[PDB]
Amino acid sequence: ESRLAAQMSFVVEIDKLKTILRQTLLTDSSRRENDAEHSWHIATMAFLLAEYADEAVQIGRVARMLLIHDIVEIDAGDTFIHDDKEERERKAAARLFGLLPPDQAAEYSALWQEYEARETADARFADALDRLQPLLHNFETEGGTWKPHGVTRAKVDKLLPRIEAGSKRLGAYARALVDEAVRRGYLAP
């Protein structure tokens, strides 16, 4: 009974990801986005946008990776990308994934490590989607996150190679979006 008990303890504990607030507001500006609903959104993108991945990418695995990528933030908190972290997240991973049975603890902690390293095919596609989504959001909200955080083209352009690493097509989309964003005054030069 202790295997399922451990699994259920993890399922219950990770509810707390819903409480971890990002700097992003929702597209309706009503409230801050949380980590759990953000991971839902990116994971959904992995399936919708699967055709743009390299052939080696395992889309279901990318989805699983994206669903678990921010679990460490339960203990480590959220940091805005444009603003100790590694150590806090390592400790978080040990405690949180440590709730699982040992096989799954090792599997999921390694899958999270793999996401952070952004080396493998799956990790690059995952990371590309995660980096793409705030561009889509910011364009839709006329710079709703960029403006209140004083984000510049320099800081955004620096992240574009991460999208390109996951998909040349999505990279090209992102570049055109950023240029038009600056044109329109959504993003400071």
Q: Which residues are at the interface with Ca ion (CB under 5 A)?
A: 24, 134, 145
3-state secondary structure of 8: helix
In the set 23, 79, 120, 133, which binds a copy of itself (CB under 8 A)? 133
**Could you tell which of a copy of itself, Ca ion, none binds residue 106, using a CB distance below 5 to 8 A set by kind?**
none
Burial label, 164 (beta-carbon count in 10 A; 0-12, 13-18, 19+): middle
Residue 145, C-beta contacts closer than 8 angstroms, at least 6 positions apart:
23, 24, 25, 134, 137, 138, 151
3-state secondary structure of 25: strand
Nearer to a copy of itself, 135 or 187 (CB): 135
DSSP 115-154: HHHT-SHHHHHHHHHHHHHHHHHHHHTTSTTTGGGT-BHH
Helices (H), the chain: 2-13, 35-48, 59-68, 73-76, 85-97, 102-117, 121-140, 153-157, 160-166, 168-184
Nearer to a copy of itself, 124 or 137 (CB): 137
Q: Kindly indicate which of the ranges 35-43, 77-85, 86-94, 154-162 contains the residues binding a copy of itself, using the contact rule CB under 8 A.
A: 35-43
Give the number of residues in contact with a copy of itself, rule: CB under 8 A.
44
Q: Residue 44: phi, psi to the nearest 5? A: -60, -45
Nearer to Ca ion, 111 or 178 (CB): 178
Burial label, 132 (beta-carbon count in 10 A; 0-12, 13-18, 19+): buried
Q: Kindly indicate which of the ranges 18-26, 78-86, 112-120, 155-163 contains the residues binding a copy of itself, using the contact rule CB under 8 A.
A: 18-26
Q: Establish if 145 lies at the interface with a copy of itself (CB under 8 A).
A: no
Q: Establish if 56 lies at the interface with a copy of itself (CB under 8 A).
A: no
Q: Establish if 120 lies at the interface with a copy of itself (CB under 8 A).
A: no
Nearer to Ca ion, 91 or 184 (CB): 184
Q: Establish if 49 lies at the interface with a copy of itself (CB under 8 A).
A: yes
- Residues within the interface to a copy of itself (CB under 8 A): 4, 7-8, 10-12, 14-19, 26-28, 30, 33-34, 36-37, 39-41, 43-45, 47-49, 59-61, 63-64, 67-68, 100, 104, 133, 136-137, 140, 169, 173
